Ligand SMILES: Cc1cc2nc3c(=O)[nH]c(=O)nc-3n(C[C@H](O)[C@H](O)[C@H](O)COP(=O)(O)OP(=O)(O)OC[C@H]3O[C@@H](n4cnc5c(N)ncnc54)[C@H](O)[C@@H]3O)c2cc1C
Ligand SMILES: Cc1cc2nc3c(=O)[nH]c(=O)nc-3n(C[C@H](O)[C@H](O)[C@H](O)COP(=O)(O)OP(=O)(O)OC[C@H]3O[C@@H](n4cnc5c(N)ncnc54)[C@H](O)[C@@H]3O)c2cc1C
């Protein structure tokens with residue numbers, strides 16, 4: 001069985017791992033291959049802090065709340081594990097700030113010790129009069145990518161640096177199943193009017209005193225386009241940028257100033273923190289995640305395509321549930337191709 | 341007016357600063373000097389993680405509770421200022437675990453977002469049946485001492501290496517007022533068998549993924565004699581040793597093993613953490629703090645002693661309230677000798 005996963009970001013590597021662990025049997029000899037244009041240090045997955053937190057407003061698709069919850073429960077059970085440190089996995093508590101009273105989120109019982117902020121706590125944030133506190137998890141993109149790659153490497157998965165021009169090219173070069181995990185660049189392989197680059201920029205800062213996440217929200221600004229402070233393992237993530245339709249890979253001075261002004265006003269201690277570096281990424285923006293099997297009529301016999309893209313700002317928060325569902329879609333192919 | 345502060349730990353340095361802040365302008369030649377046999381990294385203060393948390397057993401002492409509350413307010417005021425980094429001061433959330441049910445502490449309204457631990461959080465600690473969760477403060481001993489030193493230095497306070505033999509030694513060179521902040525060694529200057537060493541030992545570990553303090557409690561081991569994990573700015577503190585009457589300043593291997601095994605059982609990710617260092621410190625154990633005035637006769641010149649010692653395990657937690665009460669006692673000397 002020949003399988004080609006296109007892309008080496010969070011989605012591709014986890015779908016490749018999930019499929020390989022659930023379907024690579026002696027009864028199912030899988031030849032899995034990873035095809036990517038950009039790898040482990042230079043993807044949009046690396047730019048992500050890795051904080052587990054779904055949308056403030058409920059999605060149009062209810063399968064997504066299940067996939068996000070399923071990712072949390074999985075990560076939590078491995079949070080005290082001997083491998084936690086390599087994945088970049090750890091528990092964290094923090095603040096959710098608002099200007100108005102908001103209903104409690106769907107994930108209020110998934111996270112640990114959810115409650116509303118007390119007045120004396122709210123008194124610490126002059127600009128916000130309402131908010132939450134809970135304990136979540138972090139899965140840093142870069143460390144997790146480094147973990148997945150190495151775990152795949154010891155499983156025979158061969159990685160290849162190349163820009164894939166079309167599905168047919170991969171199919172004709174002997175592919176049976178094409179797992180499409182191209183993120184925002186899925187439009188280059190197949191026209192998707194529901195796809196747009198959710199451009200984001202961040203800063204990496206040396207602020208070790210920071211033990212909590214601090215996320216502010218504003219409907220005027222929109223989702224992920226308002227200041228956020230996310231402490232990592234070696235550095236703190238300074239964010240708050242979202243530009244729908246922007247394809248500029250370079251960092252810009254206005255977004256730098258926006259992030260810095262916003263986070264230093266949120267936490268004045270930050271004014272003394274050292275800028276380690278800055279990065280730019282593209283959230284694969286869609287009304288909902290595209291996670292389905294598509295038949296491609298390549299002459300007589302058809303080559304199968306599993307699309308797994310359009311994860312927006314929640315690709316780490318949801319990855320595992322999407323991986324298991326894509327694995328479920330991979331199982332249906334095996335049985336429909338007389339192999340189960 | 342000649343003042344000699346004996347002690348360069350949290351007690352001496354904070355007391356020197358308070359007497360200066362309140363009295364530099366009333367007395368024409370206010371002369372303050374600091375005498376100490378150990379400084380900056382070599383004091384008991386330096387051995388302390390600096391978590392704000394009163395003694396496990398309720399006093400029931402309103403005055404002692406006011407000294408603790410006064411310190412929290414004074415530190416919570418600095419916590420968001422762009423100077424906080426220099427004090428070694430930051431907010432930190434965490435767990436306090438017990439095998440059995442217990443009443444809420446009198447400080448439940450001093451700390452931020454105090455609550456009982458949920459059943460899903462208790463599942464993370466199989467050895468414990470009940471516990472608390474709250475947000476408090478860390479004021480790192482070494483870092484704080486450096487800030488107090490630089491505040492004192494700018495105010496022209498001078499530092500001298502001197503192992504004082506008697507109060508009479510210092511009264512003879514011209515001291516009008518001696519401030520006794522000798523911690524656990526106070527008995528050498530004036531007999532006090534109530535003051536005993538509470539031998540403690542800690543491990544300094546590199547685990548920057550740790551964002552929560554974890555403290556365990558066992559009445560059969562006694563206070564401070566149960567595993568505790570307190571993340572600092574650049575390093576994590578591992579401890580849990582209390583040895584009443586032990587004067588050994590050497591790091592013990594059995595205590596090293598007991599600290600390591602005890603903390604790795606509580607938090608298994610700690611197994612991969614790299615041990616940076618270890619220290620031993622003697623808590624100035626006394627059933628109650630010795631904070632009072634005492635007149636000396638030596639010389640035709642009057643010589644007054646202000647005692648401020650015996651803060652056990654909670655020196656950083658209580659210091660500010662004690663430093664202000666010692667400044668007020670200094671003020672009582674001026675309104676008695678007719679100099680204010
Ligand atoms: C600033 C910022 C901060 C964020 N923080 C968080 C967070 O804290 N938590 C969270 O849950 N999510 C966060 N996100 C969202 C998250 O980063 C994404 O949702 C997720 O990484 C995208 O996964 P991917 O694997 O689809 O995309 P990518 O990581 O972009 O990887 C796509 C892969 O497809 C390959 N590819 C594309 N086209 C081709 C082609 N023709 N041929 C070969 N290979 C191709 C690429 O080269 C690449 O290896 C953040 C995003 C941004 C922008
Ligand atoms: C392992 C451990 C962990 C701890 N963690 C915390 C914590 O998280 N939070 C908290 O609130 N507390 C903590 N503590 C408690 C805290 O360290 C003390 O209660 C506080 O340090 C004592 O202050 P001091 O100024 O009385 O002691 P010291 O720092 O010991 O200073 C005494 C000073 O007197 C000088 N001196 C003594 N005798 C003479 C003499 N004859 N001549 C000259 N100078 C003299 C010394 O050299 C020294 O400079 C901890 C203690 C230990 C041991």
Ligand SMILES: O=C(O)c1cc(CCc2ccc(Cl)cc2)c[nH]1
Pocket residue numbers: 051053054055056200215223224228239240241283312313314
């Ligand atoms: O910048 C992003 O794309 C991003 C950040 C996060 C974690 C912080 C956060 C802020 C806001 C909201 Cl609504 C949810 C989560 C996830 N994606």
Ligand SMILES: O=C(O)c1cc(CCc2ccc(Cl)cc2)c[nH]1
Pocket residue numbers: 389391393394395396540555563564568579580581623652653654
């Ligand atoms: O060992 C000490 O003396 C010590 C530890 C701490 C911080 C953790 C802690 C443990 C136990 C209690 Cl009761 C309160 C606080 C301060 N001093």
